[PDB]
Amino acid sequence: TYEDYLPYSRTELLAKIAEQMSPKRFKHVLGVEKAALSLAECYGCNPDKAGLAALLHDYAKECPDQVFLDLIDKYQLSPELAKWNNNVWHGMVGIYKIQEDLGLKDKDILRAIEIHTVGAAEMTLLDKVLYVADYIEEGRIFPLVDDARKIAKLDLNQAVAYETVNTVAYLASKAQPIFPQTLDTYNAFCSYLK
């Protein structure tokens, strides 16, 4: 339960989150919540924080590009962010929409949501829990997910490495631009996958 961080009960918070997104997307979010709570109890991070980070991580996934461009300007974010896309924005910039809409103040939860797509070179246990739960949640079936599910309850750092390497390989396979912080993560975790 999440009342230490937000003035919402569960039924109201899930209703508010559900107002932001498609049913396929909201079902993904509940899967990430289940996956993050089970990773939190395995690795010992606070499940109240893990579960809430999971419920909110894709809160801004469906906002149009202008919402993120306006937040970049309003909160004086690095102007270089404006050259990117929703993949980068919905976490890195969407945390400002989460704070405005919901009043979330917890730095640890906000940071985990902020980097849940691109990672960082230095990630806390909470950051890694969400980063892996988002990938391995039960509704995601893609062939590369299944080894990540196995790695994740043995060694969390190797689960992060596996995701970041497969992401850089996927982006390269489509010739899509790789955000520089995604490289920070890749180089920081490359050795755990070796």
Enumerate the known binding-site residues for Mg(2+): 28, 57-58, 90, 116, 134
Q: Which is nearer to a copy of itself, 11 or 173 (CB)?
A: 173
127 binds Mg ion (CB under 5 A): no
**CB environment 15-38: b (16+ within 10 A), e (fewer):** ebbeebbeeeebebbbbbbebbbb
166 binds a copy of itself (CB under 8 A): yes
3-state secondary structure of 20: coil
Residue with the two structure tokens 């980063």:
131
Contact track, Mg ion, 132-151, x by CB under 5 A: --x-----------------
Binding segment (CB under 8 A) for a copy of itself, from list 3-11, 97-105, 134-142, 168-176: 168-176
Cα(43)–Cα(186) distance, integer angstroms: 22
Whole-number Cα distances in Å, 84 to 46, 48, 114: 33, 32, 15
CB of 146 to Mg ion, least distance (A): 18
Please give the residue ranges that form the binding site for ligand ADP (CB under 6 A). 28, 57-58, 61, 87, 91, 116-118, 134, 167, 170-171, 176-179, 182
Cα(117)–Cα(58) distance, integer angstroms: 10
Binding segment (CB under 5 A) for Mg ion, from list 58-66, 158-166, 168-176, 178-186: 58-66
Give kind and range of the element (H or E) at residue 152: helix 145-152
CB of 11 to ligand ADP, least distance (A): 23
24 binds a copy of itself (CB under 8 A): no
Binding segment (CB under 8 A) for a copy of itself, from list 5-13, 112-120, 149-157, 172-180: 172-180
Contact track, a copy of itself, 114-153, x by CB under 8 A: ----------------------------------------
107-111: long-range contacts (C-beta < 8 A, 24 or more apart)? 108/49, 109/5, 109/49, 109/52, 109/53, 109/56
Q: Cα 171 from chain centroid?
A: 18
Q: Which residues sit at the interface with a copy of itself, rule CB under 8 A?
A: 161, 165-166, 168-169, 172-178, 180, 183, 186-187, 190-191, 193-194
